[PDB]
Amino acid sequence: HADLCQLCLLAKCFKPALPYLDVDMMDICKENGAYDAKHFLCYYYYGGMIYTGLKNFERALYFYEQAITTPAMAVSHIMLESYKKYILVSLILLGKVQQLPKYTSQIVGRFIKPLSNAYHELAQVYSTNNPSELRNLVNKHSETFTRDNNMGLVKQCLSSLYKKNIQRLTKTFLTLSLQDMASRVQLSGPQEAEKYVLHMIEDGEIFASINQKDGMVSFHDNPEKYNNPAMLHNIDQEMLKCIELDERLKAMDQEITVNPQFVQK
Amino acid sequence: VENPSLDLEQYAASYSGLMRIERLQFIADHCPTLRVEALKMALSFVQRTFNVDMYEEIHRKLSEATALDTAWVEATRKKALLKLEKLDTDLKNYKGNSIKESIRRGHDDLGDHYLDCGDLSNALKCYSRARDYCTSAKHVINMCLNVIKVSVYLQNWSHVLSYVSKAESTPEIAEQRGERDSQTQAILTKLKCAAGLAELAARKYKQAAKCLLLASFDHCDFPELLSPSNVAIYGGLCALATFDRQELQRNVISSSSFKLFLELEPQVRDIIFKFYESKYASCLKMLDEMKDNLLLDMYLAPHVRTLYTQIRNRALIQYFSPYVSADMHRMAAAFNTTVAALEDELTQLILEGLISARVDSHSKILYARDVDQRSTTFEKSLLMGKEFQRRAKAMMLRAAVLRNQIHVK
Amino acid sequence: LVQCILDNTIHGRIDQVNQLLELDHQKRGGARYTALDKWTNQLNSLNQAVVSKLA
């Protein structure tokens, strides 16, 4: 799996590798010995890059997290550039850096983190909304962000700051002028803010309508009431995933009970 | 800045001794054209009252601002030391006579000299020994008075908190069953009143006023202690900031014990009454004028900024509480600001604070937003299901990596 | 009206724009939703404990 993902990553054909990344791995092939941790980390790192390229940050963040939580005793080159991308992807999808699992290896907390200090500083700036200050840091540490080849993932953090601030205006406002809107988010122009809101509505990240006559934006914030047959099917689909997931948990539990080693203790 | 309502008669008659100097020593020196006249009255007192160390420590600055008796302070230093040694020998005679009755006044009298002398660091350690020689309930009553007053005078708050808890449990849970419903003298009134001053420094405004409001005016006027004037101000301002409408009515508005303190301070009484009666423009305006006067204090100065912000926040929430949609022009006038400034203050109160509303900047109307209970539960339950399934899959992979014993070596 | 509402004497709110008073003929048997909220919160905390039992 690591080799296939790597091959489709060098020559960019991401679509063929999708069926082997959309399934939840539950077993690891022993392969008659060998199979060191390098192959396991490679699959859950090259898979993160593949999802990141397709702008699927929800599952890309999941893949990077699995690589970090791998038990380890020494810093590896393939794990160092996964804490770094874990921060950037979490800043794009979520509003902040997500908390790592409690059972992560101690090597990441003592050795991996100090090397990744430009990304940690980027997260610190990405806690008080100020695009101008974060712009300076990006152009200051630009040599580091371009050496690790994760350039173009920091520029998306720039855009995500503007979109996050607009998504915050819906928590306090109901109708805002375009001129006034491009003064708290530092968009510097009603025309610029007009297209920023228009893009976000099409993506679905906000519910709003633009009134060009008065130059205002009205935030509806009323997506849907839960009285639909489509929502009933949506809940049922979530039901079948959990029901079938529990069945495979029970199956693997039963095989433990009939294990000759288990019965002794 | 003018102080026409504050006559010098009320200013001087409130404090006594050298505790006045530490009040205007540094904060009151940042306002020109006002200390110069007070220096005339300071030139009559600071020489007296057994001042030895502070005689030269503070006067060195004012000397350069400009004959006198420079040799007057020389003689005082030498004579003071001789007096303490003379009476020590007489005390030791009673101890050697095996008379436990006469030694009782010895330890109490010796600790008294420490306070007036100026050196108080040795009094705290001496008072620790006196605790051991106290087996009767009568002896416990006397030594409790000294320990409370000396702890504050040194400003060691960490030790104050650890030591004041001992005084709570030591005297058999408040003298057994209360000794037939309290004594004639309201000693407990003084106990809480001292605690009220300490709690304010601990950044606990609610507990400070809570343990300051039950004060009985039976003491009337005590020249030997702090004035009642600042007691009303300290209790009133902490009352407005921390307790809600129900507690304010129960403990300040309708409590017929604290109103007597409001008589000697009429300004704070108008503050609380107008706040209760939903009159905000008058309440905030005269509060703002009073701010300059309080800024010259030594005790309320590090709390003026915090308390005022809390009071204004309470006013904003209480103003919008009865409304479902409130015009911003009426609100701006009632809060001494403009519509533009009101918008910026309400956004902070909507993002995190208690206000649940949505500002409409087109017509300048603050609409109240009510969350939909049914949709909220569906959103949270589906979110929990999504998070739970992600955790289950991650744990499932963790089981595989544990069985296979995979690690980076 | 403001004094009564702040005293919890009148159950309603004032619409200052239209000079209206909307009463509180509301608060039906919606205790089911609050019960479900407690169920979700307990399940959220319980799930985390089970995964993080040992490792």
DSSP C17-42: TTTEEEE-----S-HHHHHHHHHHHH
Is-contact B283 B248, C-beta < 8 A? Answer: no
| Chains in contact with chain C (at least 3 beta-carbon pairs closer than 8 A) | A, B
CA separation for the pair B328, B338 (Å, rounded): 9
In Å, what is the CA distance from B25 to each residue of B29, B43, B297, C35? 7, 14, 11, 61
Is-contact A172 B358, C-beta < 8 A? Answer: yes
C-chain residues near A101 (CB < 8 A): 52
Beta bridge partners of C12: C23
Residues 6 or more apart whose Cβ sits within 8 Å of residue A71 = A105, B401, B406, B407, B408
Query: Do B359 and A174 lie within an 8 Å CB cutoff?
Result: yes
Pairing of strands B357-360, A216-219: unpaired
CA separation for the pair B291, B272 (Å, rounded): 16
- In residues, how long is chain A? 265
Residue B369, SS3 per DSSP: coil
CA separation for the pair B288, B294 (Å, rounded): 10
Burial per residue of B340-370, b for 16 or more beta-carbon CB atoms within 10 angstroms, e otherwise: eebbeebbebbeeeebebbbbbbebbbbbee
Residue B322, token pair as written in the block = 């009865």
First to last CA, chain C: 60
H/E/C letters for each residue in chain B?
Answer: CCCCCCCHHHHHCCCCHHHHHHHHCCHHHCCCCCHHHHHHHHCCCCCCCCCCCHHHHCHHHHHCCCCCCCCHHHHHHHHHHHHHHHCHHHHHHHHHCCCCCCCHHHHHHHHHHHHHHCCCHHHHHHHHHHHHCCCCHHHHHHHHHHHHHHHHHCCCHHHHHHHHHHHHHCCHHHHHHHCCCCCCCCHHHHHHHHHHHHHHHCCCHHHHHHCCCCCCHHHCCCCCCCCCHHHHHHHHHHHHHHCCHHHHHHHHHCCCCCHHHHHHCHHHHHHHHHHHCCCHHHHHHHHHHHHHHHCCCCCCHHHHHHHHHHHHHHHHHHHHCCEEEEEHHHHHHHCCCCHHHHHHHHHHHHHCCCCCEEEECCCCEEEECCCCHHHHHHHHHHHHHHHHHHHHHHHHHHHHHHHCCCCEC
Residues 6 or more apart whose Cβ sits within 8 Å of residue A188 = A182
Instruction: Give the containing element (helix H, strand E) for B243.
Output: none
Is-contact B250 B209, C-beta < 8 A? Answer: no
Is-contact B318 B245, C-beta < 8 A? Answer: yes
Is-contact B349 B309, C-beta < 8 A? Answer: no
Query: Do C5 and B322 lie within an 8 Å CB cutoff?
Result: yes
Identify which of B164, B149, B302 has the alpha carbon closest to the alpha carbon of residue B225: B149
- Scanning every residue of chain A, which has its alpha carbon at the shortest distance from the alpha carbon of C54? A103
CA separation for the pair B9, B183 (Å, rounded): 36
Return phi, psi of residue B281, to 5°.
Answer: -65, -45
Residue the block writes with tokens 């029901």: A243
A-chain residues near C55 (CB < 8 A): 103
Is-contact C6 B315, C-beta < 8 A? Answer: no
Identify which of A133, A182, A194 has the alpha carbon closest to the alpha carbon of residue A158: A133
Residue A121, SS3 per DSSP: helix
CA separation for the pair A249, A243 (Å, rounded): 10
Residue A146, token pair as written in the block = 């371009």
Residues 6 or more apart whose Cβ sits within 8 Å of residue C4 = C10
Show me where chain A is broken: residue before each gap, C-N > 2.5 A.
none
Pairing of strands B357-360, A173-177: parallel
Sheet holding A173-177, edge to edge: A208-211, A216-219, A173-177, B357-360, B365-368, B323-327, C12-15, C20-23
Residue A67, token pair as written in the block = 């690589």
A-chain residues near B401 (CB < 8 A): 28, 40, 70-71
Interface mutation target, options B381, B387, B397, chain C, most CBs of C under 10 Å: B381
Is-contact A67 A86, C-beta < 8 A? Answer: no
Please give the DSSP secondary-structure letter assigned to residue B408: B
CB count within 10 Å of CB B212 equals: 24
